[PDB]
């Protein structure tokens, strides 16, 4: 429940090495669960 706060924060992987985890998750689950909704969940900007 507490981890929900950090999902959409711009600096999610600050210490963790994988700085592309957000895009990896978007690619993996972007089709079934919806790309726009995944972007909203992870605080992502598709145009960016």
């Amino acid at each position: 429940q507490w981890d929900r706060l950090v999902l959409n924060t711009p600096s999610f992987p600050s210490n963790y090495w994988d700085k592309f985890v957000k895009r990896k998750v978007l690619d993996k689950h972007g089709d079934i669960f919806g790309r726009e909704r995944i972007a909203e969940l992870l605080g992502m900007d598709l145009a960016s």
């Binding site: 089709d31 669960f33 919806g34």
Partner: protein
Amino acid sequence: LDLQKDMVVMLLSLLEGNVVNGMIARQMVDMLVESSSNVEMILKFFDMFLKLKDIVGSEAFQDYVTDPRGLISKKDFQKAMDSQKQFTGPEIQFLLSCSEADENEMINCEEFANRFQEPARDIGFNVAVLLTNLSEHVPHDPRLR
């Protein structure tokens, strides 16, 4: 489909008492390879309809569904499947043909998804059993893979 289940039961009865790399198992694998295209078509039928049952419950598909009645137009169905990207073009066309849309081109997604789940469960399970048996009793055969 019930007749298919009976035929697969006959094949399993043939496989009864089979040793690893058995002659009858190898002959069955050869028969499957000879009828590869039809076997692939049957497996594709089962896979497409299971994947449809999975997709119709998906949140993206529910979003593409907008009619208060709960139905989805043919164009919306095609676009939702295209966005899912889990089907090919011909497969989506076949699904649309089977959708049984009304004169208004509206598809009852729940009924379409649930139509073939029960009729094809027995044959699907028997095919899975046959494939598992053949795979385990003929381990080193690339064709079965």
